[PDB]
Design a protein around this ligand. Structure first.
Ligand SMILES: Cc1c(C)c2c3c4c1OP(=O)(O)Oc1c(C)c(C)c5c(c1C4)Cc1c(c(c(C)c(C)c1OP(=O)(O)O5)OP(=O)(O)O2)C3
Ligand SMILES: Cc1c(C)c2c3c4c1OP(=O)(O)Oc1c(C)c(C)c5c(c1C4)Cc1c(c(c(C)c(C)c1OP(=O)(O)O5)OP(=O)(O)O2)C3
Ligand SMILES: OC[C@@]1(O)OC[C@@H](O)[C@@H](O)[C@@H]1O
Ligand SMILES: OC[C@@]1(O)OC[C@@H](O)[C@@H](O)[C@@H]1O
Ligand SMILES: [Cl-]
Ligand SMILES: [Cl-]
Length: 90
């Protein structure tokens, strides 16, 4: 089987974030113009999607991590990954 990725970007540098679901776990790689480095995101999941938006120059990232029929939303708003309110009845 294959790892599964999701990607987002912002600005004109740009910043890029790539999330990889590998063998039950999601991790994050980061580009800020000067080489790829490892991000702070680490959460369980077999499937991942992502979206992001800016308020001014402040990025807001939402990562949707799924295992079985449960999807958990993880939020980056400048100061730590927090659990979002997203729910669904799958
Ligand atoms: C994310 C994901 C996991 C965690 C899976 C599987 C798949 C999977 O989806 P994805 O990778 O998108 O799609 C596949 C792709 C692209 C290929 C080429 C596959 C398989 C899948 C399906 C089938 C498959 C699966 C296996 C194992 C051990 C093998 C050998 C295995 O045959 P393989 O010769 O790789 O063929 O179980 P595994 O615990 O990895 O479960 C089942
Ligand atoms: C428990 C279980 C069930 C009930 C599955 C599948 C898997 C599965 O997990 P597991 O067997 O541990 O991991 C896999 C391994 C080790 C290999 C080598 C696999 C697959 C899986 C994934 C992918 C796969 C699946 C298929 C079918 C018909 C094929 C041909 C098929 O490609 P196959 O050449 O076997 O590759 O559907 P199936 O109804 O069997 O659903 C999907
Ligand atoms: O500069 C890297 C970082 O802080 O960027 C914002 C988010 O992508 C974080 O997970 C990541 O560690
Ligand atoms: O500030 C976090 C939050 O309110 O952001 C907007 C949505 O992503 C919500 O699910 C999430 O709880
Ligand atoms: Cl690099
Ligand atoms: Cl964090």
């Amino acid at each position: 089987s294959s790892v599964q990725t999701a990607a987002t970007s912002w600005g004109t540098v740009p910043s890029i974030r790539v999330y990889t679901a590998n063998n039950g776990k999601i991790t994050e790689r980061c580009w800020d113009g000067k080489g790829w480095y490892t991000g702070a995101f680490n959460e369980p999941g077999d499937n991942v999607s992502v979206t992001s938006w800016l308020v001014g120059s402040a990025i807001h990232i939402r990562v949707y991590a799924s295992t079985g029929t449960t999807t958990t939303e993880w939020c980056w708003d400048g100061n730590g990954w927090t659990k979002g309110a997203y729910t669904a009845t799958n």
